[PDB]
């Protein structure tokens, strides 16, 4: 895993 990309709005949603 590289960079420090921002997570999408729903990336933490089941």
């Amino acid at each position: 895993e590289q960079e420090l990309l921002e997570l999408d709005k729903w990336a933490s949603l089941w």
Partner: antibody, heavy 132, light 108 residues
């Protein structure tokens, strides 16, 4: 039942400001988590993600264009506006707006991420040329 | 940003053929991967969302698979309207990114 249409000038001069409008029907920017994004396609090239705005006014921009892009919305008019400042011929392309579904909800409760992973409905697209 | 490598870039096929297009992500995007079909002069059309879910109204000949970094779009039986360009897109990280595209033309 979802329809989106882009409107704007077909020709703009370098260094000027480009304003594109997306008018839609079939959904409401009031729908929980719904999003409207913009993608451009330069002559004979691949699709390029530009920005997205959601029902809660949350918004994101392509990092290499964040200083020139601004996205807004008016939920009572079913429209989303994309503003691009200091344009140049590199910006010549066909611009598309698109709808992104919100998560699955059960009686208003968000229960599944699934549906949000894609831009399910795209507008016809508007060709914009930047030249002096 | 997250790089998506679509391969092959170009593919030759015949009506009735079975083709598979791949997309590799420089890092895990879980299942946040969508596939689109774009015909000349038209806007992209959604085929598969969330890596393998078939979009409503899309012919059953289209299927998608994968999770993490490797994904594939498959068309069991190629139809004339399928000779076009296809794109993958990841929506797990910002900025959302599309693959370079895969054109599918008529073989001879």
């Amino acid at each position: 039942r979802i329809t989106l249409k882009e409107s704007g000038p077909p020709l703009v001069k370098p260094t000027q400001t480009l304003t594109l409008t997306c008018s839609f029907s079939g959904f409401s920017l009031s729908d929980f988590g719904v999003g409207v994004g913009w993608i451009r396609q330069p002559p004979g090239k691949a699709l390029e993600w530009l920005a997205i705005i959601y029902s809660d006014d949350d918004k994101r921009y392509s990092p290499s264009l964040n200083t020139r892009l601004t996205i807004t919305k008016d939920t009572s008019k079913n429209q989303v506006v994309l503003v691009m400042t200091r344009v140049s011929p590199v910006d010549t392309a066909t611009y598309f707006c698109a709808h992104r579904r919100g998560p699955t909800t059960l009686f208003g409760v968000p229960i599944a991420r699934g549906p949000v992973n894609a831009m399910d409905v795209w507008g016809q697209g508007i060709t914009v040329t930047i030249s002096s | 940003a997250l790089q998506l490598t679509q391969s092959p870039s170009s593919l030759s096929a015949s009506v009735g053929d079975r083709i598979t297009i791949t997309c590799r992500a420089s890092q895990g995007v879980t299942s946040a991967l969508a596939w689109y079909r774009q015909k000349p002069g038209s806007p992209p059309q959604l085929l598969i969302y969330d890596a393998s879910s078939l979009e409503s109204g899309v012919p059953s000949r289209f299927s998608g698979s994968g999770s993490g970094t490797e994904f594939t779009l498959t068309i069991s039986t190629l139809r004339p309207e399928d000779f076009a360009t296809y794109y993958c897109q990841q929506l797990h990280f910002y900025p959302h990114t599309f693959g370079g595209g895969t054109r599918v033309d008529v073989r001879r």
